[PDB]
Amino acid sequence: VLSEGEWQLVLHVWAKVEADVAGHGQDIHIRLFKSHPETLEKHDRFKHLKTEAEMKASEDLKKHGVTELTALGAILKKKGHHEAELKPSAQSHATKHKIPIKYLEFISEAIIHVLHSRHPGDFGADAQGAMNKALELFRKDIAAKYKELGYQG
Ligand code: HEM
């Protein structure tokens, strides 16, 4: 469980993300695919994008990042009371996309990296620790749902 002050730090920097969801999402994916190229293989269409400029030019990939970050933002804003918001993504990622927990760690690391690169003044040690706690909680609850649905990845 996060403190009220930790949630405020999470939501303060998430308001900064919302000034450019699309660009944050692009940077997160580029970082994710570069640091962990195996994650690109889960995207049938995007895995054929060969350079960083091709990635930024893909409207499909840009729209996908907004879709992902909008769902994450809606989970974060429930400050842990997020079962109704989290369950549908747990379902699709367990039964259709098959995204292992390790890959959710990889993208959490990319989120942390991008937030620090774009928002250092709003992402000091305390802020980073709170965002890390919130993404850990997301992954913990995603993992429990994965199991309930029979997905051990
Ligand atoms: C913060 C973590 C993530 C969130 C919040 C998130 C959320 C979403 C949402 C809302 C969708 C669209 C609806 C759905 O199909 O469920 C989606 C689709 C998808 N996600 Fe995720 N996702 C995350 C991480 C990942 C990761 C790490 C991968 C792969 C490495 C991945 C692969 C996909 C794929 C393949 C789709 C289907 C896209 C399509 O065919 O258009 N997701 N995700």
Curated annotation (Swiss-Prot):
The keyword Heme applies. Its EC number is 1.7.-.-, 1.11.1.-. One of its GO terms (biological process) is removal of superoxide radicals. Its main location: cytoplasm. Residues 1-147 form the Globin domain. GO terms for cellular component: extracellular exosome; sarcoplasm. O2 binds at residue 64. Nitrite binds at residue 64. It is an enzyme of class 1 (oxidoreductase). It comes from the Eukaryota. Heme b binds at residue 93. Belongs to the globin family. Monomeric heme protein which primary function is to store oxygen and facilitate its diffusion within muscle tissues. Reversibly binds oxygen through a pentacoordinated heme iron and enables its timely and efficient release as needed during periods of heightened demand. Depending on the oxidative conditions of tissues and cells, and in addition to its ability to bind oxygen, it also has a nitrite reductase activity whereby it regulates the production of bioactive nitric oxide. Monomeric. This is Myoglobin. The gene is MB.
